[PDB]
Amino acid sequence: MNRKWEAKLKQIEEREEPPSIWRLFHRQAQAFNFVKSCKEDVHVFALECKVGDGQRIYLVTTYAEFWFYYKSRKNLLHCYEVIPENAVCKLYFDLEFNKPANPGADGKKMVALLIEYVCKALQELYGVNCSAEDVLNLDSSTDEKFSRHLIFQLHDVAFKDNIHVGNFLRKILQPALDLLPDLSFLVVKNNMGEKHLFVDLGVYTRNRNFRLYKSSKIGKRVALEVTEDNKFFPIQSKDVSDEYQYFLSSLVSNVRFSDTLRILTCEP
DNA sequence: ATGCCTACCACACC
DNA sequence: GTGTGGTAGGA
Ligand SMILES: Nc1ncnc2c1ncn2[C@H]1C[C@H](O)[C@@H](COP(=O)(O)OP(=O)(O)OP(=O)(O)O)O1
Ligand SMILES: [Ca+2]
Ligand SMILES: [Ca+2]
């Protein structure tokens, strides 16, 4: 209620060919206005400008059409998915830690330990069954930063929205947050030596952008790619490429339609 | 013409 | 030691 008000208060302050939808907007609110008026299943992507800052331009189109002009990786570099507020979404993680500050850290093993804990939490709290085979593991690491994105592919399950995902993780990670069951493997140090969590809990905000599979930040050149030890394999289909399957799986807001979907909620 | 909002501190107040 | 409130900085 107070979330919408500020959203529209800032909007006034800053105020035959084949079927193809490809609309750009300078403001995020305009893009979502178009989505509400479009009868097709279109979504909002955030595109970083040539400027060095985090200035974004917003694209609206379908997943199929976006992938058409995106897969070559010649154009549409540095793209982000906009996770809409109040939209059902998958369980996803942003994992980071500075390598110099953590010499003994084995990120590959912290990830495995994290997945096991989260899978146990989902079982005890929601009766949801899942394992590492249901977790799309993406990597964007460099010499200086260990970086991974995890996107859970739960069978006929989703969270009410990404805010509720955050509430779920803050709840089950409260032990680790106190260090700042034994969750100490999640504790890492940043460039200044301050103890932080291996799980970045700041990416569960309204309209959070989330770097797309095979995209990099405008400053760098390292793009998100399926990790070497990734264990989620989409069901192969003769009608779509494997890469498109991974793309769809990687989209946090692309909740597969199911006639028996369970929606998980979690309040603060 | 990007969006979002927590960690942090200064200040009452008890 | 609780309670707001007001802002700069990171994602
Ligand atoms: N300045 C910004 N404005 C808007 N959204 C942002 C901004 N910075 C980051 N985000 C969003 C997009 C990112 O995918 C997400 C997580 O940020 P962050 O972890 O810093 O980068 P990343 O996880 O995409 O790559 P990496 O972690 O490897 O640098 O938050
Ligand atoms: Ca990250
Ligand atoms: Ca992060």
Q: Give the determination technique.
A: X-ray
Residue A217's φ and ψ, nearest 5 degrees, are -65, 150
- What contacts A161, CB < 8 A, 6 or more positions away? A85, A86, A87, A88, A89
Beta strand spans in chain A (E): 23-25, 43-48, 56-61, 79-82, 92-98, 135-139, 145-152, 157-159, 187-189, 195-197, 209-211, 225-226, 262-264
Cβ-contact A43, A61 below 8 angstroms: yes
Tokens 């997943």: give the residue: A63
CA A237 to centroid of ligand 3, rounded, Å: 34
Task: Please compute Rg for chain A using Cα positions.
Answer: 19
Cβ-contact A132, A122 below 8 angstroms: no
Six-digit token pair at A222? 């390292």
Single-letter amino acid, residue A102: N
**Ligand sitting nearest the alpha carbon of A83:** 1
For residue A112, count CB atoms less than 10 angstroms from its CB and return exposed for 0-12, middle for 13-18, buried for 19 or more.
middle
Q: How far is CA A236 from CA A240, A242, A248, A250, in A?
A: 8, 7, 13, 15
For helices A2-13 and A28-37, angle between their N-to-C axes, nearest 10 degrees: 110
Tell me the C-alpha distance between A257 and A254, whole Å: 9
Domain boundaries, chain A: 2-87+207-219+238-257, 92-203
Find out whether A217 is annotated in a ligand binding site.
yes
Ligand 1 pocket member A136 (CB < 6 A): no
Tell me the C-alpha distance between A136 and A133, whole Å: 8
Q: Which one, of A138, A130, A126, A195, lies nearest residue A165 by Cα? A: A126
In a 3-state reduction of DSSP, which class is residue A249? Answer: helix
The residues facing A195 across adjacent strands are A189
Cβ-contact A35, A44 below 8 angstroms: yes
- Which residue's CA is minimally distant from atom 11 of ligand 1? A209
